[PDB]
Design a protein around this ligand. Structure first.
Ligand SMILES: [Mg+2]
Ligand SMILES: [Mg+2]
Ligand SMILES: [Mg+2]
Ligand SMILES: [Mg+2]
Ligand SMILES: [Mg+2]
Ligand SMILES: [Mg+2]
Lengths: 340, 340, 340, 340, 340, 340
């Protein structure tokens, strides 16, 4: 019954129905999503107490946003009023070789983007939570969200609260310099994190780490990661790797400690909607942590949850512990009947 | 900041879009409604702390039901698991002289209908609320919901908690005997109520009251009601009266005490959907009470809220204090712009 | 329990939702309608045995058409296979002063339009029905549908079967000559009809009748109509008249015999969709006939049914005897609850 | 042109669009389904005369239900009025490893569940049908539906009418005792059946049959089934077996007689919606029977029909003989053009 | 065949269907609107050549925006690429006394808001148009759009091109100072305008004009307006006035010159959606101008067009000259049939 | 920047949502499609100037049709008014082994079908285009469209304009004689074509060509095609071949000249909607031509475009050059993010 909070952004996602494009229809389904929303929503569905720390404008759209947070099972007690705008993006679902297309709208002028550390009573919040997840987006959105994130991490550390962080580095959306700038910001918060979500390529391409070319394969892989971990004395480092054999796609999760490495077996992956699916993996890892599960049990549970998120339309991973366990325990049951 | 709870039923409402009939389309929009849901939802939108005391099956439908309660701003902390079924009804929206058609499905075999007083920790709940509304439906649904409602009222009285009750007597859906049976049940709970919602016809047709034929008009009307009130020592009695001049329909609210009578002026009424609108009037009355408003201010506010509920599709009165006041203060403004 | 058949056309109606225009959305709801469909559908809902005599292409669209006829309660036993096309039209619903816009597609190349008398076993059909309604459209669609309609009327007369006919003359969609041509065709079938649906303007503008200018008002009106009736020895002549006072619109029905005249009182009319509403009036008249009702009872019942059809989206008048009677007997009840 | 009737239940199925969950949208498509509905609907589409024997409440929902039966091509002549409720369930469509979730609502308090043998004129019905299918659900729903089913089977036998029956045993929804109770009820009706639908596991797990452990493979399989068949002197026993190789899923149908065994070749299976697909297989078997087809032709036709049902959204197998034959005869044609 | 261009903003409008609120559904219909879009769209439907001068981001959303402009009949030749964001707002449709609620999102960080005069080849554009409408929003959105608007007006004047301008002053969305600031900007562009759209209250409340208190009624009204007009030597000044008698609402249009005044008779107004309806009135006025119509004919035509826009869902006035004339010439025809 | 025009037909396509059948829902999405529309739409998206030469009725449906052409980026300048009807078809999307079902409505009585060469100012059009594509449908629809197509080809040749033509021969929709008749018409236009789209089977089955039985495989294949090409002195001949290995389907494109042969490698094909996908391949070929690309580059680009069209719902291939190139250059990127 670990109480988890997240400091992050709420965004509006607009999606045409089925596999339609924006130019084909005026119809849309809108939802309130975001790394912190997806994470906390899934954890709330796993029956943990969750609360989102952020800001929403004091208007009907902001009110609809808070209603959505509650519906998902997330407490909106620490969602304050500020600004007038909410960040958003359009998502046109792809099919086969036609890629899914995400188009972002203004994000930095949002209620969350214009709020600063002084707008949040971190002291009061930390006193009621055991763990706090700082969304990587906070570090890059604006100087104000970055300063707030850093202060929160430092504070969380002081209160001896567990700190979680996700790398939100997207090569394609960054220039050479921006990457370096983000490097600096990540290096500033990493010293305060206990659980980190990210990939090998992040360490190399973003944090400039260099792999022991005298090593190779797993050994090289593990050496680089556990090195990064001991440097910041991280407790857990986790992520997933996508692969594809002829015809099939697979998802595999990994979980490292400074002295251990646990990888799940490749899981066939069927992609209906992958947006935000990375947050379902993290939710599974954090859940395993809250239950003091072995690294093997946690990575297996989290990887299955990640695969499940790809079969769920939209960013929010709406899964339960029983559902995930049913997939693991009963792989051949494709239809469940209840209410009899 | 009065904390209000309600003991009642949650029902599924199925409605075809626009003004379509069941035989015209397979399409539907479903919502979780009920007297207690409508009431608490509106009060939560008026910014009061609300909580629903009831049961929902431990299945995906029940889970979606709790999610809906939270979305509306109602705490689901006291919603327990029980049964497998949820009551429901279909609502085919009418137009002009074509009446709206409501068709009920099984209601008594619901999770709420099969739960008894021993399934609820009333002691613990009452300790955290200042007022409790007992939905009239509780008294007629099943012997179990009736026994639970009576026990709750008695208990609420002991704890000196304010008690609210709504007459849910529908002539058309009752036989001669059933009416008499309900009379007995109402007479049993009325001694414990402080605020009661109902109409003159209820007192006469259900409670068998007889009006002073030596009197007439308002005087006769008031004599009968304040007599009923002093008999149970009720604090507030409120309801609405619908009328129609040539071409127009009107709504008028009234609020009585043992020594006073406040009636609002007739308000033109436009009917898009009247289902549950009676609960918006009650919410307005209760809100006025929580703010210690004059009888005039409360009845005026509540009547406008009632008219507004008729313009809102569905049972849930999703109005705010500012919205109601804007209608009162700015009758000619039909379009509001925000977020500038 | 009069068994009624109709000889007519089935058409596809495409309607964008709400009050949207074709240029605003790609969305549509399609339905199978037509004078004969609307008529028989309503009569089937009034619990009479009905059957449509027509043709539909032997393809999936034609099959969906027969399924729709059955759903409405109309027997599809006499619906034969022929052609490949089905007539259709688009209906963009108007609002306020913006008129409803109907746009027709090819109608004469339909399965019904290319079928001739020899394609129908009228002898066998007439042997199982007591009344047959010949849709006025049959006389103008094509020479083949016209020849079939005339033969059916003659035959129906021989078998001493009651014959009903509706004037389907639309001034706006006819040239000077076409009107004259249709005059001839109507004069050919009228000698075989018992019950006729039409208006005063039809007699004057289409049948070239001339009113006694020495008379005026009702007397003149009645003289012209009963004159037309005795000439063809018609049993019943019925129709409706639309009027408008300041602010309100009204509908009024009239029913004539060679020696009587019954007019209903003006009924306030609210227009959501008037397409095909004329067929609901006729259905009410025919129903009154089947029940051997007085002219007053029939015209009152039919006029209310006509008003109700205007509140129902789409051409099909989906009303029941109880519903109509409820409107007459309980004018102030706008919401009906059942299933308790 | 075999005339087939079915004694069974009509249920409401609620399904959110696409692959959405109940917690994601208020939107739904509702349909009238049930074993007897699915079966007769498919057979009617195969052009056989069909009629459903059951009860529906005398309200608008019940009326919409009868309209749906007719639309599907099923006669509603023997659908009587009774009760007020209709059983129902929600179906949230799964995708990939996310299973489809079915949630049932009250089923036993339905119009069909409260009706007894005395409410049905079986004598009159049997006189107009050549075959009658008794839905296995009848035996377990309520004592009243069970007693009615047994009486109907006995009667059908007396009139020498062919009797069909489907095992509706779901391990997951039964306790140890309930299974035994159902065993008894099945043993009571089996002596009257000619054609039975079920699986090997039913015989072993439900009917407690024991396989010759001295045998193995097909021989053992066949020995057990033909033993069960001769015991009740059944004419046909049929069912399907689902299997899965790496990557692909398959469906295979089997048809036994007391002296023969016909199995179809594995057919690749693509699952869009499997609910009720078992009734499409049965419809194919019964159709083959009505045409006096060889066991090979019947099992091949039925298996393809079963695969097709999985590609059709919803429970109702809306297939035609030509469509099934086209799949068999032209496996590479994925697009058919008509109406040219 | 006057060629008209407009310099303005394109915005995204999100609207839930029917009269639903944001908190009731995730469903939306999105459209590309804006003063310049609404104006040019209607004029294009009136068959004039139109072109919008603005910027849209070079992304899929911007591309969908240009597609919408073309669909409406507006040339997108002068729509350049710039920025990444598009302004937007949500519109929850009201009903009866429940007002319509508009909630704006970020508008100043749009592609249009960040573009400056140097980004537009006004010289080249002006050479191909006879008239240019400068949207009042340009003057208040950003300093860059303001500077561009002013430069365009000056240039248009030099080329002797007709210049149109609309007051976009909304009291409710402005502070005391902002109003004064806008006063200055309007005073700067007014000297270059020929046709101006606005109301009396704009002159008084925004431009600080003072009415001759020694005068009254029409005389006073006209004195103030023709004074404002001669000061800037304006050619035409037009607008509308909304009024309401008991039960009904009315719309009335007025058109002034320095020496004349033409007012239309009050037109009953039915409000389905008034957003942008003001642009339909302007389109009617401009159309009358392009046809060199009398002031009476222009104001009558424009007022009817304005009333029609209120019956059309959405901001875009999709009316034609024939449609408007049909309403004027045939007030009692509520249904038009074509394609016969 | 090649300016391309097409002479062809516009049709209405009606499609139920998802994979629903006509008998399952009244809902539909309608679109304006046709060989010429699909072709020009894709080319316009590839940024070439396009214009459709055809006729549309002068009614609201025809107007909506022109609006759709513009939205797609196609100039509607040469779309004239004529007739009253528009051809159409219904498309029920298949799934797995359930084929997609297309049902045509009347096509020959359309505005395009009743127009003749004298209704088109080919001289004026040809003067503004560099290439003209004559849709094969023109040759078979009606004698009038055929005569117009032939005249246009002859004229285009005179003006030395590039001429493109597509074989629109569907074996299944033709009798023995009709095929021969079409042979004659194709032989008449082929002498004027430069670029032709079709398959080997067309040459053999329609044009009666005979393959060198002394040859085999590729050599035989190429001999037959280059023989057909030199006979009419064609410049380019292109088409695609569908194949299927166990489990997978593939698409392969080929491009021939009189002296060369270029075939693309098999591309895995995923079929969501193949209707009109053949026009996306042609658009890719023509685009390659306009860019003077090598045969290899053109066939590779076009085949990928063809595969992409199968993943797009509806007939219109809405792809861009960058999108196609992204699929070729980045095969493993299934999600693209923009607007950052
Ligand atoms: Mg996802
Ligand atoms: Mg209401
Ligand atoms: Mg109607
Ligand atoms: Mg199925
Ligand atoms: Mg408007
Ligand atoms: Mg395609």
């Amino acid at each position: 019954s670990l109480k988890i909070a997240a400091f992050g952004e709420v965004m509006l996602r607009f999606t045409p129905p089925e596999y339609l494009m924006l130019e084909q229809t005026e119809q849309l389904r809108m939802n309130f999503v975001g790394t912190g929303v997806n994470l906390l929503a899934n954890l709330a569905h796993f029956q943990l107490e969750t609360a989102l720390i952020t800001k929403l404008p004091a208007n009907r759209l902001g009110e609809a946003g808070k209603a959505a947070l509650r519906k998902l099972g997330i407490s909106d007690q620490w969602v304050g009023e500020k600004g007038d705008h909410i960040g958003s993006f359009f998502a046109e679902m792809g099919y086969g070789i036609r890629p899914t297309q995400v188009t972002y709208q203004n994000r930095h002028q949002s209620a969350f983007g214009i709020s600063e550390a002084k707008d949040y009573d971190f002291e009061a919040f930390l006193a009621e939570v055991d763990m706090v997840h700082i969304c990587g987006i906070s570090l890059s959105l604006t100087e104000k969200t970055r300063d707030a994130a850093l202060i929160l991490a430092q504070k969380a550390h002081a209160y001896q609260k567990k700190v979680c962080f996700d790398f939100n580095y997207r090569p394609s959306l960054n220039t050479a310099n921006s990457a370096l700038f983000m490097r600096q910001q990540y290096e500033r918060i990493l010293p305060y994190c206990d659980i980190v979500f990210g990939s090998r390529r992040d360490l190399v391409e973003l944090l400039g780490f260099i792999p022991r070319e005298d090593l190779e394969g797993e050994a090289q892989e593990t050496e680089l990661i556990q090195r990064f971990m001991s440097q910041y004395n991280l407790e857990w480092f986790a992520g997933t790797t996508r692969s594809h054999s002829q015809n099939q796609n697979y998802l595999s999760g990994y979980l490292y400690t400074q002295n251990e490495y646990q990888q799940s077996e490749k899981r066939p992956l069927l992609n209906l909607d992958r947006i935000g699916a990375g947050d379902a993996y993290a939710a599974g890892i954090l859940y395993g942590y809250s239950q003091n599960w072995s690294l093997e049990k946690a990575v297996t549970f989290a990887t299955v949850n990640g695969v499940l998120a790809h079969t769920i339309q939209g960013d929010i991973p709406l899964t339960t512990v029983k559902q995930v366990n049913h997939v693991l325990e009963h792989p051949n049951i494709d239809l469940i009947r209840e209410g009899h």
